[PDB]
Symmetry: C2
Subunit: 285 residues, 2 copies
């Protein structure tokens, strides 16, 4: 296992912690070891090791944004960002748990939850208009054109003909999408990455995790994720409160949202997560 293989390193980083009682989340590039108060990104390849300096810079930049919540703070020293390669990266662990959709059936909760989503997305939107932020995060072009190519290459082989025709209609609108690079975009903002303390009182946003796919891009990508997980009414409430309920934005959201399962499937494919891949491919095979 990953915990077994990196036993010696983990014992230095987490002294006196039994690596039996640790969790592991799979990434495309990093295996992230989850401890009580912190997470250890272990590179899967030397190429992955070479990306961790940049990642440390990215997470530092995110930790200084005004999002109204926490983010995984890098626990390396600043000079780590100057390295060719890192053998690991330690980040603070954001406390709290995800929110089941059930909770949003209460009207006051939904109001409160939507409001804090808005704060977060407004923070991200404004941060993506900052030249120092834009300079530190990736901003790939024709990502939608390219993403469609990656689905056809990497996911169609796992699909039925029916699933492939379904995917094709969904990929069809992508080539028409405007290529927007205006906001900081988490890129995988499903419910499991948005952590709440519902200890005392109504749900209060603790923070946001799993920034692997972060970029300067289109805010509709993150609103789509929320739409996918929580449905139309809750989305609409976020759009109203944030002032993003225009037809142009809504159109983009709907187009991206229709691809969101495929986004999760492509991710699960690349990071070897089999149950996430099965879920994402639900109705495609």
């Amino acid at each position: 296992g990953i915990l077994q293989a990196n036993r010696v390193l983990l014992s230095r980083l987490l002294p006196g912690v039994e690596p039996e009682g640790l969790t592991v989340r799979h990434g495309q590039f990093h295996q992230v070891v989850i401890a009580s108060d912190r997470v250890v990104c272990l590179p899967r390849t030397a190429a992955a090791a070479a990306r961790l300096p940049r990642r440390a810079a990215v997470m530092r930049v995110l930790a200084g944004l005004d999002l109204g919540c926490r983010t995984p703070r890098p626990l390396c020293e600043g000079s780590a960002e100057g390295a060719v390669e890192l053998p690991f990266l330690v980040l603070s662990r954001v406390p709290g748990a995800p929110l089941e959709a059930d909770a949003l059936e209460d009207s006051k909760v939904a109001e409160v939850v939507a409001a804090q989503y808005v704060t977060l997305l407004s923070g991200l939107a404004s941060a993506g208009a900052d030249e120092k932020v834009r300079a530190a995060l990736p901003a790939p072009q024709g990502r939608w054109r390219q993403f469609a190519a990656d689905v056809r290459a990497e996911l169609f082989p796992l699909m039925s003909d029916g699933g492939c025709r379904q995917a094709e209609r969904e990929l069809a609108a992508l080539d028409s999408l405007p290529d927007i690079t205006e906001a900081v975009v988490h890129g995988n903002l499903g419910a499991e990455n948005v952590l709440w303390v519902r200890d005392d009182g109504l749900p209060r946003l603790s923070g946001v995790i799993d920034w692997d796919e972060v970029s300067i891009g289109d805010p509709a990508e993150d609103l789509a994720a929320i739409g996918a997980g929580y449905g139309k009414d809750f989305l609409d409430q976020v759009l109203t409160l944030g002032g993003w309920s225009d037809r142009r934005m809504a159109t983009r959201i709907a187009t991206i949202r229709a691809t969101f399962a495929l986004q999760q499937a492509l991710s699960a494919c690349r990071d070897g997560d089999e149950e996430e891949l099965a879920d994402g491919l639900t109705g495609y095979r």
Copy 2:
């Protein structure tokens, strides 16, 4: 009425559905702080503290950006009575009795080094230097306050000793190379425990933060944990030159006078008595 009742409107906004009478309120030199599970709300008492709260929020923003190897209180929300919501760093202080175990002591010393390195490094960053106070000849203004306010409370001997201590303090070089927490006692350093050896969670109470001499934070560590443990920290960090030992000792021996001067102004006669122990 109560502080919680008094601020109940704001608390219902900031902490929706949270029973205000279930919260706690700690105090300080400038701020009333309401403690909730995962965050605190800073309220100013003085009209001056209300005006300075924007600056402190911008400072905490900068601190939340640095690489210190641990958490700091992240600004979540500011508004106008002005308020500032900060994250609650989890964990508790480490009892000095923990340092009796030498494997614990090594790990703690190591983590302190990382913190102080981060603080040191940050001092060089001009962005940080701009957003943080860099008061020149701070130690001399202090000495004048001591003479003005404390000498009259003191014996002739006390004044001899104190004057000797302020003399040493004037001869110190005016150093502004590092971010200096300013108040780095055991209470403001929080740890994760009962999951292997103590891991540094984060640091709080940055109100006295400045660009200055790192010997100030190192003295504070030594005050709280003793000179054996500080020596461990000084060796790991490569700070065990005698110039540094001098600045630390000079600064260390002003803590009684600092406490007394604080207690004098605070009208906190218990502290003033303890601070002046030996000076009267």
